[PDB]
Design a protein around this ligand. Structure first.
Ligand SMILES: Cc1nc2cc(-c3ccn[nH]3)c(NC(=O)c3cccc(C(F)(F)F)n3)cc2n1C
Length: 285
């Protein structure tokens, strides 16, 4: 439709024959169910994601199905694709500032995100999840690594390969990232309410600047700090990222309130994305 059909050979020419060397050393590999390569079509920089074989083809076809129906400022934009043999490629609009994970970790010496930018990213990401949920899709892998940032640090949700259409069902194949996954999701339930839980973990990543899981940490899983703060063992202020100078307590506590609500172990007691949107909008009012 709107999507250009590339040959693998065209995308090989765009990506310097899919140079797996990092962009920093002069290759085309930017990040990693596949590797994301930098591409040049004319005067447009693009991101080329090269991905069981029939199950990969389903994730490919799903991404195209979702990206065909879902177009929104807080979602990545598919420019085209390539289906030539056992080599499946998806071409998107280039995101100059990479993933939220990378920027929260200040990877490659990038400056720390201000509270103001962090609040806009949270709102953007929420607006993107709202669009997917309004259009009866469940992401099933909402994480900081799947939230990409454009030139204006506008949040764009990515990776809809495992996305499901939405009456809560169950699955034999349990997918997602443990550190972000809700209890029912880990048990095989498929609900948009599980996406909310995962976002709660992302809101804690934004507040703390800490990764969802760290082997050499206590607690190892970031979601466990909710208990420490509820059992008055620690405070939110003890966990607030020290790499910010513009974080007012009222606003940080307000985002934690949403994160805590999002992270209710009872699916039905979690807020819907529309409420998450409203609460985060009120936070910046
Ligand atoms: C310095 C730097 N690091 C980067 C990391 C990624 C990155 C992290 C994880 N996947 N891709 C990235 N991604 C994209 O441009 C992009 C854009 C749209 C869609 C995708 C898709 F493939 F994920 F669907 N990727 C750009 C990056 N830049 C410019």
């Amino acid at each position: 439709t709107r999507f250009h059909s590339f040959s693998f050979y065209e995308l090989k020419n765009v990506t310097n024959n899919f140079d797996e060397r990092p962009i920093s050393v002069g290759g085309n590999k930017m990040g990693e169910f596949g590797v994301v390569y930098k591409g040049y079509v004319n005067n447009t920089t693009v991101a080329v994601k090269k991905l069981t074989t029939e199950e990969l083809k389903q994730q490919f076809d799903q991404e195209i199905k979702v990206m065909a129906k879902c177009q929104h400022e807080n979602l990545v934009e598919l420019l085209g694709f390539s289906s030539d043999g056992d080599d499946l490629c998806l071409v998107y609009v280039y995101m100059p500032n990479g993933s939220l994970l990378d920027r929260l970790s200040c990877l490659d010496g990038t400056p720390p995100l201000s509270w103001h930018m962090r609040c806009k990213i949270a709102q953007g990401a929420a607006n993107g999840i709202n669009f997917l949920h309004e259009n009866h899709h469940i992401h099933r892998d909402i994480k900081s690594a799947n939230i990409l940032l454009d030139e204006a640090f506008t949040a764009k949700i990515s990776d809809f390969g495992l996305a499901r259409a939405s009456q809560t069902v169950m699955t034999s194949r349990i997918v997602g990232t443990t550190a972000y996954m809700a209890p029912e999701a880990l048990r095989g339930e498929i609900t948009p309410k599980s996406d909310i839980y995962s976002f709660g973990v992302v809101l804690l990543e934004i507040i703390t600047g800490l990764p969802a899981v760290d082997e050499h940490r206590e607690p190892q899983l970031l979601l466990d700090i909710k208990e420490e703060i509820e059992d008055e063992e620690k405070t939110i202020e003890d966990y607030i990222d020290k790499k910010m100078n513009d974080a007012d307590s009222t606003s940080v506590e307000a985002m934690y309130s949403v994160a805590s609500q999002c992270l209710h172990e009872k699916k039905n007691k979690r807020p819907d994305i529309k409420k998450v949107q409203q609460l985060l909008q009120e936070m910046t009012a």
